[PDB]
Amino acid sequence: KLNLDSIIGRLLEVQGSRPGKNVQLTENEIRGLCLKSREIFLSQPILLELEAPLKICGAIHGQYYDLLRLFEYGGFPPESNYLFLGDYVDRGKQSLETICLLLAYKIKYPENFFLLRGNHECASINRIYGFYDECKRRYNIKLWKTFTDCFNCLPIAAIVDEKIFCCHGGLSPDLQSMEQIRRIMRPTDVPDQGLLCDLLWSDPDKDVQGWGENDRGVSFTFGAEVVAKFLHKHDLDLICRAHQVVEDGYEFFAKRQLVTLFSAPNYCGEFDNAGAMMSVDETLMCSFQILKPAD
Amino acid sequence: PGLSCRFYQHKFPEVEDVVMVNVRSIAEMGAYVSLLEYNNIEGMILLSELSRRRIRSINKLIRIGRNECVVVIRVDKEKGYIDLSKRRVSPEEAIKCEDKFTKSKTVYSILRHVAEVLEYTKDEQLESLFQRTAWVFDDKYKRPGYGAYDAFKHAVSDPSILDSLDLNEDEREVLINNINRRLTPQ
Amino acid sequence: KIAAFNIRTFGETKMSNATLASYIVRIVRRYDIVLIQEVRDSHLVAVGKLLDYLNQDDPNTYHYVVSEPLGRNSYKERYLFLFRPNKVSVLDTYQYDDGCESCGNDSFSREPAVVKFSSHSTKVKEFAIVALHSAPSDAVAEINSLYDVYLDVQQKWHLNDVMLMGDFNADCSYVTSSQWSSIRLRTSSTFQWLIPDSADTTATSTNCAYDRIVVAGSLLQSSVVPGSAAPFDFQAAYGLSNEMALAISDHYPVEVTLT
Amino acid sequence: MCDEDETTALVCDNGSGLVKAGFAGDDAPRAVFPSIVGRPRHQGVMVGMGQKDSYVGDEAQSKRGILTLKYPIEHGIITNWDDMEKIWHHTFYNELRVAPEEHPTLLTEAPLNPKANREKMTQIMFETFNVPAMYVAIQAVLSLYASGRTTGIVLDSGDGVTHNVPIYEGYALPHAIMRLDLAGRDLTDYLMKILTERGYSFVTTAEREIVRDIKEKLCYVALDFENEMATAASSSSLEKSYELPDGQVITIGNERFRCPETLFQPSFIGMESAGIHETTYNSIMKCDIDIRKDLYANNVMSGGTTMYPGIADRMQKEITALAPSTMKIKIIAPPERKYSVWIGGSILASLSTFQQMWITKQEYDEAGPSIVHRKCF
Amino acid sequence: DVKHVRFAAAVEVWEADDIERKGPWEQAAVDRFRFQRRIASVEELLSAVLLRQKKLLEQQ
Ligand SMILES: Nc1ncnc2c1ncn2[C@@H]1O[C@H](COP(=O)(O)OP(=O)(O)OP(=O)(O)O)[C@@H](O)[C@H]1O
Ligand SMILES: [Ca+2]
Ligand SMILES: [Mn+2]
């Protein structure tokens, strides 16, 4: 058996810590979490269809202490259903505590808690924003190569109540029909180009019309009209998305028909932003709760 | 090859100092640069803010061969690592940097040419020339670069301030001449 | 035959003035089990010095148990147990847990160390010893907290036969007459009080019951030789002057004797 | 990188003061600890633990007083195998925390390490730790490789020995090597000695650690000893003050340079032997006059005792005084040289050609510890 | 059952911690890369040596 509650215990036990205490687990515990959660992700749809109420959250980037305080106010699983919009690893102090806690809850409550693939959930990039090094030191590279094979199987996007479309990055020029998503096979890496890539990498931009280029050097920007076009075609009312720090934690775009969510406050210590999450009520009335740092 | 030297007495910049750098190459984790002020020591400008899969030459206008203003974030003197960022520089700080650099580069430009006329064959002699000349004033004003430039401009008004520098007559003669060629205002 | 001993700032200084080391080893040879307190030693050089004196005739005249350094701030101290291995043997030991100190959880300045001893020669055959050097300011709280430590011993080793002793600072300025009402360890019928409130355990002109011995458990409580519990006035015994006495320590050892 | 994991190898620098340990391809060792083993003088136990046979490292160092401390390496040579075995065991299972039967290991030996010791050290790795493979390379040759040369002349000066090691095309030259039995330990003792002259005292086993700390902050090599002495005698310009842990402040003057001056003047500690500069010169003079030019041009410093300020300048001067005045003398003193040896292993370990070199446990079992003589320089 | 999206206009706010947030790993990657370049710099030179040692010692 996998002692799932022992793992979750030790992970949560550090909540009241000052300073930021580390959590110590074994390779065969964490190797367990990956191999056990991998099955779950391959069983559930590549494009999730879900039902309200649920709380939706943006990037976390290993900001483990902040993740805990999100749960502290939003309520721990399964008392609130959750959907997370990717970007779990890299940059923050504690990628491993972060991804392990989320993989743990995804095994503990497999129908009450969901994880979408961010852009950082691929090898080639967490090689260079530091997750590979957090592994190389605290455990070993052999562990990291397992986490990669976990990430290569996460779901891409979610539609809540057939009306809110969520994914990590945004739209694509090639995203014409949902079946193109459902036809992507897993496991897969994130390629440099095309639908899968664009879903993870793209951005809204008010200064652009149609499919503009992107400073990130992969995939596109998209303008306020392109949202309006997409919503109608699929009978949606909202796009929700992450992938980009914004000061308010929630930033509306395109006439309040798209929103970008960033959950990590005071990101990397480099920015003065609030972090935020979106509580979807059962009636599909959204609301926001904002984890705002002190000035 | 010809002689080269540090602009300032200090062999390394301090953290939170803003420095002028030449962008030499772009690599996966950032741009390798050369610190012009510190005898072309290697520093590196870090990939920062927005996530990149790959970096185009154009990104943040970092380009190649360009001189750019950056703040020093981290120095390992033990390893010789200097890590830099373009993100935190304000436009006024860039201008102050370009001014400090222009002045200091001018002082260097004089003293290398002074050493050329004095036929100094070693960077050791060039540094000695700097230690006895520029860096005395650098202390006098307690200012890197500005102190030297200010004194060198004063030497046009009155040359007698060069007498306290512990110089050979030959050094002083060449210096007075060389200053006249470079700082007499056209 | 058991005893506790606060040796004021025991350390490399005091163990090198070899006049004092002589007196201290003359005191410590008295005992089958002895607890030595205020060990202000960072590298176990004072302790090694003491052991070399004690074991100089026979390489197992004494064995030792010694705590890692204890305290909130930088002023750490250690506990030292010395026991003659031919009389008793130490079976198990631990320190009573009180959590992290930054998060404010700690209950004791100096985490009581606790020891379980085999004693083949006595009536009581297995019994446990609790060691406390209290912080004088926290005397009330720390002595009261020992009750929870006793309960932890029952929970850990299933043993009622337990001996608590040390410098509780439990008299005069640090625990006045009224404060005892609050203290489970004194008011409970579980525990006999062997060192009375009349006992001078000070070599100084105080008259203060700072050291204490308190026992729980039927075998152990009946193993005590009656009236044997007392301070050992080494000043009187060896005929030292006042100043030489305090140079050893201001607090005498206290003893009790077992059958 | 480990794009498929070929196992990351281990690098162990067996210092007589400090053992240094980490993984190939890291740029610094993870674990550096004193090379001491301490067996208990008496029977007993730490609260909450059983009776230990032997502490190692800082665990030994902090429990000094109840132990018989032993250094298993004396003057760079391994003297005491049954303790050396415990230092390797502590390295693997307590510091690096890796099962050594998984990871190849690269080992460092001092210059002129006698054939028997190199054998014994191989045999303990293949029979006590069952390592998959391992390699032994001379500590100073790695410090040169760290600096990116294959010809040079390394003054390596640690805690327990000092060595001048002329190297050409990657091999240290056996005969030309000079030892000197003076090193950072003696300098620490001499610094205690001279500091007693101001009425300061260092009896307590805390205080001798403070004196090692003072040495590696406030000392430096002066360029002209006599003039520096005159300067120190006449003026408070050179005096620095060190704050002891108890809050007492002490002032260090001529001691600051008198201390490492002993490397140039061994006679200060009563050693009737030539100073580091004479030893350098002599070493070069023992080499073929053909190559001396390269050696003079590529003089390298290494080891923690070369970390003094000013030492490369003084060596520049002193060797310029002994050399023909025609030569380009050049002294290289890399800022990391405190770990030049380790890093040289780290680099050497990480090479594509290098992982063809080492002795495998296969080869070992087929040929015995004699094979280490085929697979060292 | 055609549900359609609505917003609560006002928002809850919770104070985020002072706990310092920057990960060292982002930097340690750079060091790993600097060092890997340092290795590759040396390898041309140093590799020649080892091959020579190999070829000489393979005679024995
Ligand atoms: N900055 C410094 N200034 C002066 N001395 C220093 C400095 N850093 C380290 N040392 C000294 O260098 C010595 C340690 O160097 P190193 O680790 O190379 O020795 P080692 O390799 O253990 O010794 P050996 O090579 O003799 O076996 C110690 O004496 C230490 O105090
Ligand atoms: Ca060494
Ligand atoms: Mn992202």
Side-chain angles (χ1 to χ4, degrees):
Chain A
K1 191 180 179 179
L2 187 55
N3 190 347
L4 208 68
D5 308 339
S6 178
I7 298 166
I8 291 164
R10 275 172 288 161
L11 284 164
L12 298 174
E13 275 155 34
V14 299
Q15 182 177 352
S17 299
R18 183 167 57 258
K21 191 176 194 178
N22 280 1
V23 176
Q24 285 298 341
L25 313 166
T26 78
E27 168 163 355
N28 289 306
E29 287 179 319
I30 300 177
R31 200 161 221 293
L33 292 170
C34 304
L35 294 170
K36 180 59 234 166
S37 62
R38 189 170 189 264
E39 306 189 314
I40 299 177
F41 302 132
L42 285 162
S43 70
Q44 290 179 344
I46 184 159
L47 175 57
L48 295 177
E49 326 284 354
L50 310 169
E51 299 156 8
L54 76 181
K55 307 202 181 300
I56 314 189
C57 282
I60 300 294
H61 285 307
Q63 294 195 195
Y64 181 65
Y65 274 84
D66 301 314
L67 175 62
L68 295 184
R69 297 218 85 177
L70 287 180
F71 284 155
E72 183 175 339
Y73 300 125
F76 295 81
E79 80 204 355
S80 304
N81 304 298
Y82 282 84
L83 178 65
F84 282 89
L85 302 162
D87 284 358
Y88 312 115
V89 298
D90 291 316
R91 300 205 198 238
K93 283 182 175 168
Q94 285 170 286
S95 318
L96 280 170
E97 288 90 340
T98 298
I99 186 62
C100 295
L101 181 61
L102 301 175
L103 286 184
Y105 281 134
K106 187 51 172 163
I107 297 157
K108 176 82 167 179
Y109 314 114
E111 282 305 320
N112 305 92
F113 195 94
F114 298 82
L115 299 182
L116 297 185
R117 197 178 186 165
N119 55 298
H120 284 264
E121 283 69 49
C122 66
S124 51
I125 179 166
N126 66 52
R127 188 67 76 86
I128 90 180
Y129 283 82
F131 180 60
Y132 180 96
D133 293 276
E134 184 173 347
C135 281
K136 192 195 190 190
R137 212 220 187 296
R138 293 176 67 186
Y139 296 87
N140 52 67
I141 288 154
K142 205 173 179 192
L143 169 50
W144 176 84
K145 275 173 167 289
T146 303
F147 272 115
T148 288
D149 288 352
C150 159
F151 291 170
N152 286 351
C153 301
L154 280 167
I156 307 309
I159 311 174
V160 175
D161 290 59
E162 294 185 299
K163 270 288 176 187
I164 299 173
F165 178 94
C166 286
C167 67
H168 172 59
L171 290 173
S172 170
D174 295 337
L175 177 49
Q176 297 304 329
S177 176
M178 294 294 169
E179 275 303 294
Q180 301 165 254
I181 295 177
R182 293 200 198 95
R183 287 164 193 293
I184 288 167
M185 282 308 303
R186 293 176 291 165
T188 185
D189 201 1
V190 173
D192 313 341
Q193 63 210 54
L195 173 57
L196 173 50
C197 171
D198 300 338
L199 277 158
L200 272 49
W201 275 105
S202 59
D203 286 290
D205 195 349
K206 55 198 165 190
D207 298 349
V208 167
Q209 280 185 288
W211 303 104
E213 278 298 292
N214 200 321
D215 187 64
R216 299 184 202 243
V218 153
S219 195
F220 300 99
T221 48
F222 53 82
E225 193 191 62
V226 185
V227 163
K229 281 165 163 171
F230 183 77
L231 289 170
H232 152 76
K233 184 165 186 167
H234 297 280
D235 201 4
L236 293 157
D237 282 13
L238 176 68
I239 292 182
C240 180
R241 167 272 175 188
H243 192 42
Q244 188 158 49
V245 56
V246 294
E247 204 204 24
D248 295 354
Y250 81 105
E251 188 154 297
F252 285 115
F253 173 73
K255 201 175 186 170
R256 185 144 154 165
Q257 306 186 310
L258 179 153
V259 52
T260 290
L261 283 176
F262 206 79
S263 288
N266 180 226
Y267 176 40
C268 307
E270 289 289 356
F271 298 86
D272 209 12
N273 67 288
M277 68 159 78
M278 183 173 71
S279 293
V280 182
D281 177 56
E282 181 273 338
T283 63
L284 213 64
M285 176 150 69
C286 303
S287 54
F288 301 101
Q289 299 105 347
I290 302 183
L291 186 57
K292 193 218 173 190
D295 300 347
Chain B
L3 298 196
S4 186
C5 193
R6 302 159 176 124
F7 288 8
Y8 318 111
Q9 190 168 21
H10 316 273
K11 298 193 182 181
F12 291 96
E14 301 174 299
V15 169
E16 295 174 283
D17 196 22
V18 184
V19 298
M20 186 62 137
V21 304
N22 184 261
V23 176
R24 206 162 204 169
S25 185
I26 294 182
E28 276 200 288
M29 309 192 174
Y32 285 107
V33 308
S34 194
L35 285 77
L36 291 172
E37 294 173 272
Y38 295 89
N39 188 49
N40 299 294
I41 287 165
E42 270 204 298
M44 190 166 172
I45 300 171
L46 271 49
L47 286 182
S48 41
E49 49 179 3
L50 207 76
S51 16
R52 275 57 176 219
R53 278 213 58 183
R54 60 201 180 201
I55 173 162
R56 297 173 177 177
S57 178
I58 64 161
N59 292 137
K60 294 181 70 65
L61 285 65
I62 281 174
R63 279 300 197 175
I64 190 168
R66 300 210 82 258
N67 304 337
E68 298 292 317
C69 320
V70 292
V71 69
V72 175
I73 284 197
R74 165 260 186 140
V75 182
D76 262 287
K77 287 194 195 188
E78 312 172 290
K79 302 181 172 183
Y81 297 154
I82 305 175
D83 293 319
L84 302 163
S85 176
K86 197 167 181 195
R87 198 183 74 84
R88 298 170 187 222
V89 173
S90 313
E92 289 213 71
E93 296 175 298
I95 293 159
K96 291 167 182 184
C97 176
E98 192 158 80
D99 177 67
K100 178 183 176 193
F101 176 76
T102 298
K103 285 169 177 167
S104 302
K105 184 190 169 193
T106 303
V107 175
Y108 177 94
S109 190
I110 296 159
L111 285 165
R112 188 186 168 179
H113 191 47
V114 163
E116 183 179 71
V117 173
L118 291 166
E119 301 160 283
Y120 285 142
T121 50
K122 287 199 172 186
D123 311 73
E124 281 171 68
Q125 294 283 288
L126 180 56
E127 188 177 272
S128 181
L129 178 66
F130 271 83
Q131 302 186 340
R132 290 182 293 120
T133 313
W135 298 345
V136 171
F137 288 118
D138 211 77
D139 179 76
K140 178 173 181 168
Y141 295 92
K142 297 170 187 180
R143 278 178 153 286
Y146 287 91
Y149 183 89
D150 186 73
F152 275 51
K153 195 174 182 181
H154 274 76
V156 175
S157 71
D158 183 299
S160 319
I161 62 154
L162 294 171
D163 177 61
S164 61
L165 271 58
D166 302 341
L167 292 170
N168 284 9
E169 184 184 75
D170 312 78
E171 297 180 293
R172 195 173 297 175
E173 185 192 287
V174 167
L175 182 61
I176 284 168
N177 195 304
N178 220 265
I179 290 172
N180 290 335
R181 288 178 171 190
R182 292 283 196 216
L183 254 65
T184 296
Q186 294 182 357
Chain C
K1 181 169 175 170
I2 299 173
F5 190 19
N6 188 346
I7 298 168
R8 176 167 71 194
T9 62
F10 173 97
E12 290 168 59
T13 303
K14 189 183 288 285
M15 274 307 306
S16 298
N17 187 312
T19 291
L20 301 181
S22 76
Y23 283 133
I24 276 165
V25 156
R26 202 177 170 190
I27 294 170
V28 166
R29 279 169 198 264
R30 285 174 65 77
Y31 300 121
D32 304 338
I33 297 168
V34 62
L35 180 65
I36 275 171
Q37 297 161 126
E38 287 197 15
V39 170
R40 287 261 41 252
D41 175 352
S42 57
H43 285 83
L44 302 179
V45 175
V47 174
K49 218 135 186 180
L50 190 54
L51 290 183
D52 281 342
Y53 279 44
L54 289 173
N55 281 339
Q56 76 177 355
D57 309 316
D58 175 334
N60 290 273
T61 308
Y62 277 95
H63 292 190
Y64 71 88
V65 175
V66 74
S67 81
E68 285 284 50
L70 309 174
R72 294 183 177 125
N73 64 73
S74 61
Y75 186 86
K76 304 304 188 196
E77 295 185 356
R78 299 179 178 258
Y79 289 128
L80 188 68
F81 293 97
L82 283 176
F83 66 88
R84 307 171 160 264
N86 72 38
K87 298 304 181 195
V88 313
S89 283
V90 162
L91 296 168
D92 201 13
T93 59
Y94 76 105
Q95 271 148 228
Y96 167 80
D97 190 5
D98 61 0
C100 297
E101 312 91 295
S102 67
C103 295
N105 304 288
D106 83 49
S107 55
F108 290 105
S109 183
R110 282 171 287 261
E111 321 181 8
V114 177
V115 184
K116 189 186 173 194
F117 286 94
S118 159
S119 185
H120 75 286
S121 58
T122 45
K123 299 181 180 182
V124 57
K125 292 305 198 194
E126 294 176 11
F127 72 113
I129 301 192
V130 177
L132 165 69
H133 183 207
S134 71
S137 53
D138 308 15
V140 184
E142 289 194 321
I143 303 157
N144 189 33
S145 300
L146 287 176
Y147 189 91
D148 302 313
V149 183
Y150 168 73
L151 299 180
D152 179 53
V153 169
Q154 295 181 301
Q155 167 184 339
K156 191 179 188 70
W157 294 330
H158 312 310
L159 180 62
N160 294 334
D161 301 289
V162 177
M163 168 177 258
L164 291 87
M165 70 189 179
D167 198 351
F168 297 165
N169 290 286
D171 209 4
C172 294
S173 57
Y174 308 126
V175 173
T176 69
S177 308
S178 54
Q179 291 171 290
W180 285 114
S181 56
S182 71
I183 300 175
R184 289 177 291 168
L185 206 80
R186 183 68 180 262
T187 52
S188 181
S189 76
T190 314
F191 301 103
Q192 299 172 344
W193 278 61
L194 295 166
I195 311 292
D197 312 317
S198 57
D200 187 8
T201 83
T202 65
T204 41
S205 77
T206 34
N207 177 28
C208 298
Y210 288 150
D211 310 86
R212 293 294 178 135
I213 324 182
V214 180
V215 287
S218 56
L219 292 162
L220 186 63
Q221 283 164 345
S222 54
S223 294
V224 165
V225 173
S228 67
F232 175 55
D233 176 1
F234 56 74
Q235 177 178 347
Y238 303 170
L240 318 183
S241 90
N242 163 68
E243 306 61 37
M244 175 55 65
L246 305 181
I248 295 160
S249 175
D250 47 4
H251 293 176
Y252 292 138
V254 289
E255 50 158 43
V256 60
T257 318
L258 289 193
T259 55
Chain D
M1 308 172 205
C2 290
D3 301 5
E4 269 299 297
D5 189 2
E6 319 90 342
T7 71
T8 315
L10 311 174
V11 164
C12 244
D13 189 35
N14 299 295
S16 66
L18 303 162
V19 164
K20 321 182 190 74
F23 289 88
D26 289 5
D27 69 315
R30 294 195 175 175
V32 177
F33 62 84
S35 327
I36 61 192
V37 180
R39 302 220 179 71
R41 299 186 212 143
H42 303 299
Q43 317 308 331
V45 300
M46 295 305 308
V47 168
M49 301 212 159
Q51 187 163 309
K52 300 217 170 181
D53 288 315
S54 60
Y55 301 95
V56 182
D58 283 319
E59 204 173 358
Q61 195 76 286
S62 50
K63 289 174 176 56
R64 166 174 290 136
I66 58 156
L67 312 177
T68 280
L69 290 174
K70 279 208 181 173
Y71 296 75
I73 302 156
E74 296 165 62
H75 307 335
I77 298 297
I78 286 157
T79 55
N80 182 359
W81 294 98
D82 292 358
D83 286 353
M84 198 55 222
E85 191 180 311
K86 292 186 174 210
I87 287 204
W88 288 327
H89 184 284
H90 175 84
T91 284
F92 303 143
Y93 298 108
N94 293 64
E95 290 299 347
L96 306 184
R97 304 185 166 188
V98 289
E101 47 267 65
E102 306 171 342
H103 299 272
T105 295
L106 168 138
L107 286 156
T108 76
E109 72 160 17
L112 298 181
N113 192 51
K115 278 206 155 198
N117 279 37
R118 198 193 288 154
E119 289 178 304
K120 184 71 197 149
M121 179 158 70
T122 295
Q123 175 161 47
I124 290 163
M125 289 305 151
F126 284 118
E127 298 178 3
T128 298
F129 298 106
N130 288 290
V131 297
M134 59 113 261
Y135 195 72
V136 161
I138 302 171
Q139 284 181 34
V141 180
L142 299 175
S143 280
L144 189 72
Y145 295 172
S147 83
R149 298 178 164 73
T150 59
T151 295
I153 180 159
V154 181
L155 174 88
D156 191 30
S157 179
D159 194 55
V161 79
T162 293
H163 274 96
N164 297 265
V165 197
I167 302 167
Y168 174 80
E169 290 189 12
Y171 295 79
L173 295 159
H175 54 272
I177 290 159
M178 289 293 283
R179 177 162 167 174
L180 170 80
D181 282 310
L182 157 58
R185 199 172 300 157
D186 311 286
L187 305 184
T188 313
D189 294 341
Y190 180 81
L191 178 58
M192 295 169 75
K193 182 182 178 178
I194 68 190
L195 283 168
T196 69
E197 301 167 9
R198 299 196 177 220
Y200 314 147
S201 194
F202 307 106
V203 193
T204 300
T205 56
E207 302 172 325
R208 185 169 176 283
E209 298 315 322
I210 297 160
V211 172
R212 186 176 39 62
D213 194 55
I214 289 161
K215 178 192 68 192
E216 61 185 79
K217 285 170 183 169
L218 299 192
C219 289
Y220 64 98
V221 171
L223 187 63
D224 181 9
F225 176 63
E226 288 296 331
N227 186 59
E228 203 72 330
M229 276 305 298
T231 304
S234 53
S235 75
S236 298
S237 61
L238 300 179
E239 299 209 307
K240 284 193 169 187
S241 293
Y242 185 99
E243 182 183 344
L244 306 173
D246 69 3
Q248 177 171 358
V249 168
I250 63 158
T251 308
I252 325 300
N254 48 77
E255 299 84 356
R256 294 183 60 217
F257 48 92
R258 281 168 69 200
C259 168
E261 185 62 19
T262 62
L263 295 167
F264 298 92
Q265 297 193 58
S267 63
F268 283 21
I269 56 161
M271 290 186 66
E272 290 198 66
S273 297
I276 59 170
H277 64 270
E278 288 167 304
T279 49
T280 305
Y281 175 79
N282 290 339
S283 183
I284 299 151
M285 292 301 104
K286 286 161 183 203
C287 312
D288 301 357
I289 187 158
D290 340 314
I291 75 152
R292 290 180 196 174
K293 186 152 183 182
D294 294 4
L295 306 180
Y296 274 123
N298 291 278
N299 180 306
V300 188
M301 292 192 158
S302 175
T305 278
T306 60
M307 284 309 286
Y308 295 108
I311 190 184
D313 305 353
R314 175 70 171 280
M315 270 267 269
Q316 185 61 26
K317 174 191 183 184
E318 292 281 13
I319 301 158
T320 298
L322 314 185
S325 55
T326 61
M327 288 294 181
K328 177 176 174 188
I329 304 306
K330 183 177 175 197
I331 304 307
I332 299 95
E336 75 266 54
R337 61 197 174 283
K338 187 164 195 148
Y339 302 103
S340 277
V341 174
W342 188 82
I343 290 174
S346 186
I347 291 176
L348 180 59
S350 297
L351 304 190
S352 58
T353 45
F354 177 63
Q355 297 178 340
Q356 306 165 8
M357 291 303 281
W358 18 36
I359 316 139
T360 59
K361 188 166 159 59
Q362 183 152 23
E363 282 149 300
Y364 172 88
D365 292 344
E366 286 154 351
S370 79
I371 205 154
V372 81
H373 304 316
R374 278 197 181 68
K375 294 197 158 213
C376 168
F377 300 153
Chain E
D1 296 15
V2 56
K3 316 169 80 162
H4 50 277
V5 176
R6 306 155 56 198
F7 285 94
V11 298
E12 310 186 51
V13 62
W14 306 315
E15 177 176 44
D17 293 349
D18 59 310
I19 294 291
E20 184 286 308
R21 293 186 165 82
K22 194 161 188 181
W25 310 106
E26 194 174 46
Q27 172 186 262
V30 179
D31 299 0
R32 169 169 50 78
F33 176 66
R34 288 161 168 295
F35 190 88
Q36 188 61 41
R37 196 179 61 133
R38 177 170 179 172
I39 294 164
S41 170
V42 156
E43 192 271 340
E44 255 283 354
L45 158 72
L46 193 22
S47 193
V49 155
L50 304 169
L51 288 168
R52 196 182 306 118
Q53 291 184 343
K54 197 162 191 295
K55 285 194 173 188
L56 288 169
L57 291 162
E58 279 180 6
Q59 300 182 1
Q60 299 189 346

Short mmCIF file of all heavy atoms in Angstrom, two decimals, chain D residues 1 28 71 77 90 129 189 196 203 236 247 255 375:
data_model
loop_
_atom_site.label_atom_id
_atom_site.label_comp_id
_atom_site.label_asym_id
_atom_site.label_seq_id
_atom_site.Cartn_x
_atom_site.Cartn_y
_atom_site.Cartn_z
N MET D 1 24.64 16.69 -20.38
CA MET D 1 24.31 16.34 -18.97
C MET D 1 24.09 14.82 -18.89
O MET D 1 24.43 14.10 -19.83
CB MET D 1 23.07 17.12 -18.48
CG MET D 1 23.11 18.65 -18.67
SD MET D 1 21.58 19.54 -18.29
CE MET D 1 21.66 21.05 -19.28
N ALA D 28 31.55 22.46 -6.84
CA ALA D 28 32.13 22.52 -5.50
C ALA D 28 31.81 21.21 -4.77
O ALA D 28 30.78 20.60 -5.04
CB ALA D 28 31.59 23.74 -4.77
N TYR D 71 44.42 11.22 13.57
CA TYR D 71 44.41 11.58 12.17
C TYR D 71 44.97 10.41 11.40
O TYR D 71 46.10 10.02 11.64
CB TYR D 71 45.34 12.78 11.98
CG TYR D 71 44.88 14.03 12.70
CD1 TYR D 71 45.02 14.17 14.08
CD2 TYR D 71 44.33 15.09 11.99
CE1 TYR D 71 44.60 15.32 14.73
CE2 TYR D 71 43.92 16.25 12.62
CZ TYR D 71 44.04 16.36 14.00
OH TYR D 71 43.61 17.52 14.60
N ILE D 77 50.27 11.36 3.89
CA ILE D 77 50.35 9.94 3.64
C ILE D 77 49.39 9.23 4.60
O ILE D 77 49.28 9.66 5.74
CB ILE D 77 51.80 9.47 3.80
CG1 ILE D 77 52.71 10.14 2.79
CG2 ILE D 77 51.94 7.94 3.73
CD1 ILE D 77 52.39 9.82 1.33
N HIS D 90 32.23 7.00 6.69
CA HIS D 90 31.48 8.18 7.08
C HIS D 90 31.18 9.09 5.89
O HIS D 90 30.09 9.66 5.80
CB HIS D 90 32.27 8.97 8.11
CG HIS D 90 31.61 10.23 8.46
ND1 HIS D 90 30.62 10.28 9.42
CD2 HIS D 90 31.79 11.47 8.03
CE1 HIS D 90 30.23 11.54 9.56
NE2 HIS D 90 30.94 12.29 8.73
N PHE D 129 33.84 -1.48 0.19
CA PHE D 129 32.70 -0.69 -0.29
C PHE D 129 32.11 -1.23 -1.60
O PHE D 129 31.10 -0.71 -2.06
CB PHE D 129 33.16 0.76 -0.36
CG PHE D 129 33.56 1.29 1.00
CD1 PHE D 129 34.89 1.48 1.35
CD2 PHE D 129 32.60 1.60 1.96
CE1 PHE D 129 35.23 1.98 2.60
CE2 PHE D 129 32.95 2.09 3.21
CZ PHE D 129 34.26 2.28 3.53
N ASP D 189 50.01 26.74 15.08
CA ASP D 189 50.70 26.60 16.35
C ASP D 189 51.64 27.79 16.58
O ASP D 189 51.70 28.32 17.69
CB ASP D 189 51.44 25.27 16.40
CG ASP D 189 50.58 24.01 16.40
OD1 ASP D 189 49.37 24.11 16.72
OD2 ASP D 189 51.12 22.91 16.08
N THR D 196 51.03 34.65 22.30
CA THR D 196 51.23 34.63 23.75
C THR D 196 52.14 35.80 24.18
O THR D 196 52.13 36.20 25.34
CB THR D 196 51.83 33.32 24.27
OG1 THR D 196 53.18 33.20 23.81
CG2 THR D 196 51.03 32.09 23.88
N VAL D 203 44.49 28.21 25.96
CA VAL D 203 44.56 26.89 26.58
C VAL D 203 43.34 26.05 26.18
O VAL D 203 43.48 24.94 25.64
CB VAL D 203 44.68 26.96 28.12
CG1 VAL D 203 45.06 25.60 28.72
CG2 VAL D 203 45.62 28.06 28.61
N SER D 236 50.70 52.01 13.94
CA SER D 236 49.52 51.19 14.15
C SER D 236 48.77 50.93 12.84
O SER D 236 47.67 50.37 12.85
CB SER D 236 48.62 51.80 15.22
OG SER D 236 49.29 51.89 16.47
N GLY D 247 33.45 38.15 23.60
CA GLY D 247 33.29 39.60 23.50
C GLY D 247 34.58 40.38 23.76
O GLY D 247 34.60 41.60 23.60
N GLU D 255 52.49 40.04 13.95
CA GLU D 255 52.07 38.65 13.91
C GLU D 255 51.40 38.32 12.58
O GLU D 255 51.58 37.22 12.07
CB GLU D 255 51.12 38.36 15.08
CG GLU D 255 51.74 38.59 16.46
CD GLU D 255 51.74 40.00 17.04
OE1 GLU D 255 51.30 40.93 16.34
OE2 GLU D 255 52.18 40.18 18.21
N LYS D 375 46.93 2.03 -13.56
CA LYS D 375 45.84 2.97 -13.79
C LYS D 375 45.89 4.13 -12.78
O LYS D 375 44.92 4.54 -12.13
CB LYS D 375 44.55 2.14 -13.86
CG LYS D 375 44.44 1.18 -15.06
CD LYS D 375 43.02 0.69 -15.33
CE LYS D 375 42.85 0.23 -16.74
NZ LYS D 375 41.50 0.50 -17.25
#
